[PDB]
Amino acid sequence: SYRDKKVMSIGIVKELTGLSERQIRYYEKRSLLFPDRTNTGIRKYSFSDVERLMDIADRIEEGVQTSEIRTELAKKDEARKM
Amino acid sequence: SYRDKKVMSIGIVKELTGLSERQIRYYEKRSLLFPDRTNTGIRKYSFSDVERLMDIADRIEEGVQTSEIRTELAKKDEARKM
DNA sequence: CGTGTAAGGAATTCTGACACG
DNA sequence: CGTGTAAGGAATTCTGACACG
């Protein structure tokens, strides 16, 4: 159950994903991932979010807009619940 | 492999374990766990360290000195490698 | 449209110490 | 011996903006 527990701040994610804080916080602004937040506002990510970020980055490179990606991901969640 | 990846700063550990930063940093000073460190000195813990902390706290409550605990844990590592 | 940067501040962690015991 | 606290500073994150495009 460790995979989905939100426990690592943005700095760690930046390293694990090789992405800038600008990119990471933006994808979230595009509703591509929903990190948790501490009462003091610091964003908390889980290992699952770390991978989600790598998928987003992959599609971004392949010249894909967040919207398209946002849809792709949406389709993947309904099936997971099945 | 998420279980052992060092990714969460002391604040998160404090919450997950209900232990004070004083206790956590001390157990490490007693060589009861070895957190990673970022180049900027911030300590990094893994889910495995989180559990290790709960075992330490458990024995501490049962009136056990870190030394004894340190030994108990030592014995558990050799067997794991087997 | 995705992303880089400088800006000012708010919250986090770190270390060594004094304390009691 | 394990742990609480105040102290001063160093590093982290957050947000909104200007930029190009």
From Swiss-Prot, chains A, B:
GO biological process: cellular response to nitrogen levels; nitrogen catabolite activation of transcription
Keyword Cytoplasm: no
Domain named HTH merR-type: residues: 7-75
Keyword terms, alphabetized: Activator, DNA-binding, Repressor, Transcription, Transcription regulation
Activity control summary: Under conditions of nitrogen excess, the DNA-binding activity is inhibited by the formation of a stable complex with feedback-inhibited GlnA.
Keyword flag tRNA processing: no
GO MF, one annotated term: DNA-binding transcription factor activity
DNA-binding region: 10-29
Induction: Under conditions of nitrogen excess, repressed by GlnR. Under conditions of nitrogen-limited growth, it positively regulates its own expression.
Described purpose of this protein according to its UniProt entry: Transcription regulator that actives the transcription of genes required for nitrogen assimilation during nitrogen limitation. On the contrary of the MerR members, which require longer DNA sites for high-affinity binding, TnrA requires a DNA sequence of 17 nucleotides as minimal binding site.
Quaternary context: Homodimer. Under conditions of nitrogen excess, TnrA forms a stable complex with feedback-inhibited GlnA.
Further comment found in the protein's record: The amino acid sequences of the N-terminal DNA binding domains of TnrA and GlnR are highly similar, and both proteins bind to DNA sequences with a common consensus sequence. In contrast, the C-terminal signal transduction domains of TnrA and GlnR have no homology.
Name listed for the protein in its UniProt record: HTH-type transcriptional regulator TnrA
Organism, scientific name: Priestia megaterium (strain WSH-002)
Gene (name only): tnrA
